[PDB]
Amino acid sequence: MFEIKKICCIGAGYVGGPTCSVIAHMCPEIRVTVVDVNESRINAWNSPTLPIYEPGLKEVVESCRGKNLFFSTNIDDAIKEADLVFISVNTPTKTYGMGKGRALDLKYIEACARRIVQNSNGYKIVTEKSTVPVRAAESIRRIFDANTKPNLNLQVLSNPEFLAEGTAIKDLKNPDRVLIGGDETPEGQRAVQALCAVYEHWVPREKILTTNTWSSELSKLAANAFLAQRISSINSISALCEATGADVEEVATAIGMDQRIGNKFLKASVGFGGSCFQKDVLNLVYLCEALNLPEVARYWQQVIDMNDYQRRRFASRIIDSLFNTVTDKKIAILGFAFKKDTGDTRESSSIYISKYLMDEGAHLHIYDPKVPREQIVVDLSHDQVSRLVTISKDPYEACDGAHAVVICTEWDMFKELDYERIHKKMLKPAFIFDGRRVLDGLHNELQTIGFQIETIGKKV
Amino acid sequence: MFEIKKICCIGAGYVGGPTCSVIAHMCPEIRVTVVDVNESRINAWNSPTLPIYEPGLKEVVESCRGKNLFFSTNIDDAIKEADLVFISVNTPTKTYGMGKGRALDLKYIEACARRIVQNSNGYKIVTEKSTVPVRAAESIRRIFDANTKPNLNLQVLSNPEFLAEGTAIKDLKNPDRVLIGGDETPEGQRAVQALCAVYEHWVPREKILTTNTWSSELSKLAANAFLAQRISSINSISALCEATGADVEEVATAIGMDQRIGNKFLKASVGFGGSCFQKDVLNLVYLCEALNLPEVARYWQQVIDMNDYQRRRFASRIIDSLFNTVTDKKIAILGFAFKKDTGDTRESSSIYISKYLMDEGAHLHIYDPKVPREQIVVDLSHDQVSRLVTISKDPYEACDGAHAVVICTEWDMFKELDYERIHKKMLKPAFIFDGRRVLDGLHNELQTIGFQIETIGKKV
Amino acid sequence: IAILGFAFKKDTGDTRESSSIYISKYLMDEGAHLHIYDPKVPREQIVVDLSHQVSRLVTISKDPYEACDGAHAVVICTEWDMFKELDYERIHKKMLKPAFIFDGRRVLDGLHNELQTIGFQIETIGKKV
Ligand SMILES: NC(=O)c1ccc[n+]([C@@H]2O[C@H](COP(=O)([O-])OP(=O)(O)OC[C@H]3O[C@@H](n4cnc5c(N)ncnc54)[C@H](O)[C@@H]3O)[C@@H](O)[C@H]2O)c1
Numbered sequence A, B: 001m002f003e004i005k006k007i008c009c010i011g012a013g014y015v016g017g018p019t020c021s022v023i024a025h026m027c028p029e030i031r032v033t034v035v036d037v038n039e040s041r042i043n044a045w046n047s048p049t050l051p052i053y054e055p056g057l058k059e060v061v062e063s064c065r066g067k068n069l070f071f072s073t074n075i076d077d078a079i080k081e082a083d084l085v086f087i088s089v090n091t092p093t094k095t096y097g098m099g100k101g102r103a104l105d106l107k108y109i110e111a112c113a114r115r116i117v118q119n120s121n122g123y124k125i126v127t128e129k130s131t132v133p134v135r136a137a138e139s140i141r142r143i144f145d146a147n148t149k150p151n152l153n154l155q156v157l158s159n160p161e162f163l164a165e166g167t168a169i170k171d172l173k174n175p176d177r178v179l180i181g182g183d184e185t186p187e188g189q190r191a192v193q194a195l196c197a198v199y200e201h202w203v204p205r206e207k208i209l210t211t212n213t214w215s216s217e218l219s220k221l222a223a224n225a226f227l228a229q230r231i232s233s234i235n236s237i238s239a240l241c242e243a244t245g246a247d248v249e250e251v252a253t254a255i256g257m258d259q260r261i262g263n264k265f266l267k268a269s270v271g272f273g274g275s276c277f278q279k280d281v282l283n284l285v286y287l288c289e290a291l292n293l294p295e296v297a298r299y300w301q302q303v304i305d306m307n308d309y310q311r312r313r314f315a316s317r318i319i320d321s322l323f324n325t326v327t328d329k330k331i332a333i334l335g336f337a338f339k340k341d342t343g344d345t346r347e348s349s350s351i352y353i354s355k356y357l358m359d360e361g362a363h364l365h366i367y368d369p370k371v372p373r374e375q376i377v378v379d380l381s382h383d384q385v386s387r388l389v390t391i392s393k394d395p396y397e398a399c400d401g402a403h404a405v406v407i408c409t410e411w412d413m414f415k416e417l418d419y420e421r422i423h424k425k426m427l428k429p430a431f432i433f434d435g436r437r438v439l440d441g442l443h444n445e446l447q448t449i450g451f452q453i454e455t456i457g458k459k460v
Numbered sequence C: 001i002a003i004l005g006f007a008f009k010k011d012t013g014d015t016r017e018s019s020s021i022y023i024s025k026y027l028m029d030e031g032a033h034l035h036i037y038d039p040k041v042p043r044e045q046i047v048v049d050l051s052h053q054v055s056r057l058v059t060i061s062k063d064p065y066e067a068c069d070g071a072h073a074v075v076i077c078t079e080w081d082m083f084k085e086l087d088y089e090r091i092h093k094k095m096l097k098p099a100f101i102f103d104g105r106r107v108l109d110g111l112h113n114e115l116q117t118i119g120f121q122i123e124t125i126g127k128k129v
């Protein structure tokens, strides 16, 4: 029936940019226009230095930009001529008012919905791509119906994104699945199938799953919650191991070889970070409370409480090992990003571990091979940062004269440091706190050198 | 290089029988003796009708029973001549005293350890196969050391079993992994390697996992807890689906296509049953309380609380839908086993759903195509069973004149019943409560017939 | 399990609110076979205190060596002076192994090295094991 030939995407961020670049790369006969109110970001997308780094993104953008891929600030015209409008704007957690710290702020979504229906005539498919609360598409449909024009036919779909930081291009070109939600109406099914035809240019039909709108919105939140639960579950086991003499890596391996459980996302850690795990679980908890489902709410709250407990007890282990006082002591923080091979620090466990040690008056020397130094200062600010926080240029400066080395991010270079050299210039006794299990197999060497080595999920 | 040549297994039950039968079948040059204090069970192993039924088991015993596989009641001699002693006795949940309903009763394990160290001389490997609490092998080692003899060297290992009902022979011949735990000492590592050599006759080397003793015991408990957590998580989502219009089957499919999450054990239900899920999760919770880990304890307690909530809300949904009273009403309970294709009813959700409706004075007519009627009477007893419970011999008798049909077990035949016939002789309005999603795709046909059809994870 | 001492303190036969009653009931709830000896408490009183199970689990011994014969543990609840002077090498020979002594009154202080040499695992209140 209907064929999508022109695509507009509102939001040229971590999601809108790469997704539309790949669609343009895979669909040569489709014009794809990405729009954003942030002009510096849009100009960056047309500049030869893109505003977000993803492996393979530069080659894909440069192969389409100007031909069928466009980045613009002319939002109204892009909406006007588009057959399909992606909504890919930010939905941050509300930091204010009712639902503070749990509910999502929908003001940017609503601004899009108002601006879309203002600049639209005829038939258009509007697709929710941002992570939204369940039934948010009902709000968009209400706004569209309450501002309808003659011959204005706007169809609303849900199409969540599942890409992860660092592998976006591979995830977009070979996705585990593409998820599309729509109404069970004849009009909805025509819009769902039209969006399926776009993805069918490079995604097998067997990988394209179509559901109703609410199942699609809920699936995005639930998927991230299931992932975070695996991390919190194995972290809860790490605490059991420390008290029993078991080893969390051995237990995780034994658990993960059951193919019904799987062997992915069972790496114990000081705690999961990233911009979406805590946000999506807390949103789920808030949604359940609003729907009078307190049992479900407290069920998923345990994922967050366990992650916070894993962080706090790790900070307590450092403080207790350092003779119950770390005031004016130099402590090396190796790793500040929430995972390796990135500079993103949002909700990184290094932030919370650092603030715990700062509350005790410790002198932190933080080294991360990729995180910008200005970001670390901003993250540790609410003064206290000037007195206590020092950003080192290399790990050996951070460990010079330190009582303990705290590894919070699994950077591969930390495995290869010269620890006999580090031990010589550390105050004695010297401690290593491995919050990522990156030094496994090196404990006998480190103990022979003279370190007291402690790691998560291993009895001391 | 020590070589295990004679194996004794104390306990000829669901675990000891099949495991030793497979070891005998795969190791023709190893004598395997399975002993037990129950003579009627031992004779049933030697009779042409086995006490426990498992597909393919009857062929394995009959191919070895007499060559290298034996079933005797002479426990003392089997221990005397064995190089390897399996402990495969029952470890029930304590029904009394401290830890009631959570801790495991170790009196049978201790009986083995005392009897072994009395009937043993020389070198023997004693292996924990029963599900035991963490550090239970430490207790076995204390009994052996406190009753030492000259020339007595007893090594203690952990080797849990992961077989499931219905696929025991398949799981034993092709296991996802074999888990062996022992002490990290030369005496222990030697004993570990001897037991690996037995399994190496038919299990690839990379699938044989060696850990310390505590990791092995803990891995058995944690593996079942992770599996139960998946069911409770998807069940918690089913409640969210009913309140939002999403569908739990669509959401589970969308979640399961993430290969990091996997698509197994995501089938929403009225609640998981079986003899080990609740027992192992509750034991884990009890262990965390004894070790002063209340955060970990309440984390895993949520798996049980969610399973209880899913059961109670399903019963409350039936009562609320039936105009808030079901006293003296006829209700058909289709399915009493804890899963399909078995007669086992231990911790079956049908037991708890039935008791909820019995507390309301409902007249239950229960049909299960495989559960013995005497077992159903035992499960629903403490009277109340005589007045309220009727055990039908076909589903149509149970649905004759009933207000509602409650499906608790996913037997395939329930999808194939004649529902026009059932509707004609049911009181009106007639309800179907599908606690297993077995009638999916039939909702339009059932609604046209006149049923009010309600299922878990689907808005009414 | 041998219960040495049932009165609430030494040099009396009074058992009112004695800790031996509560310690015994805790072990009885666990199904233990209690053999109770007290040099002054009337045996009929012990039965009344442990009543509302007493027939199955509670046995009142006439001497301490009878109570410790074949027992897993010796639990001292009353500070009777005679308990300090028992022949523990003799008691250890007829006890199941491992054999434990739980001193709830600190009456065996200073005797721990001998008892450990004999083979007892000796535990008392206010002392790390
Ligand atoms: N970060 C991830 O990896 C990822 C993965 C999947 C889902 N998501 C979800 O995708 C959404 C987008 O995330 P992101 O990281 O790309 O966000 P982002 O903040 O980087 O991008 C949103 C962009 O939209 C612009 N914008 C906001 N309101 C606008 C409006 N009214 N008109 C035009 N432009 C507007 C912003 O200036 C920004 O450039 C979020 O809801 C997020 O939860 C994120």
Ligand SMILES: NC(=O)c1ccc[n+]([C@@H]2O[C@H](COP(=O)([O-])OP(=O)(O)OC[C@H]3O[C@@H](n4cnc5c(N)ncnc54)[C@H](O)[C@@H]3O)[C@@H](O)[C@H]2O)c1
Pocket (backbone or CB within 6 Å): B010, B011, B012, B013, B014, B015, B016, B035, B036, B037, B038, B041, B075, B088, B089, B090, B091, B092, B108, B111, B112, B129, B130, B131, B132, B161, B162, B163, B164, B165, B275, B276
């Ligand atoms: N699918 C499963 O059922 C399964 C899976 C893995 C692990 N397990 C664990 O395996 C263990 C055994 O389970 P089961 O179902 O085989 O139990 P079971 O009751 O069928 O078998 C135990 C057998 O041991 C005998 N026995 C008990 N004490 C004895 C003693 N002192 N001497 C000799 N024989 C003695 C009993 O008479 C009985 O025949 C349990 O701890 C269970 O949790 C069960």
Ligand SMILES: O=c1ccn([C@@H]2O[C@H](COP(=O)(O)OP(=O)(O)O[C@H]3O[C@H](CO)[C@@H](O)[C@H](O)[C@H]3O)[C@@H](O)[C@H]2O)c(=O)[nH]1
Pocket (backbone or CB within 6 Å): A161, A162, A163, A164, A165, A166, A224, A227, A231, A264, A265, A266, A267, A268, A269, A271, A272, A273, A274, A275, A276, A277, A338, A339, A340
């Ligand atoms: O076994 C594990 C796996 C991950 N983590 C941590 O979990 C966090 C999240 O890492 P990861 O999931 O790889 O990164 P994200 O970029 O946040 O990706 C997630 O969040 C995205 C944003 O919504 C989703 O789209 C993706 O599906 C989901 O993988 C990081 O702090 C990791 O170190 C662990 O501690 N142990």
Ligand SMILES: O=c1ccn([C@@H]2O[C@H](COP(=O)(O)OP(=O)(O)O[C@H]3O[C@H](CO)[C@@H](O)[C@H](O)[C@H]3O)[C@@H](O)[C@H]2O)c(=O)[nH]1
Pocket (backbone or CB within 6 Å): B161, B162, B163, B164, B165, B224, B227, B231, B264, B265, B266, B267, B268, B269, B271, B272, B273, B274, B275, B276, B277, B338, B339, B340
């Ligand atoms: O998606 C699912 C999967 C299972 N179940 C239920 O979960 C229970 C357990 O099912 P299953 O795991 O197949 O039964 P068991 O035979 O008890 O096997 C489990 O328990 C054994 C120990 O008894 C372990 O060894 C096995 O690995 C583990 O699968 C049953 O009530 C099922 O109906 C669900 O409700 N949804």
Ligand SMILES: [Cl-]
Pocket (backbone or CB within 6 Å): A098, A099, A100
């Ligand atoms: Cl609030």
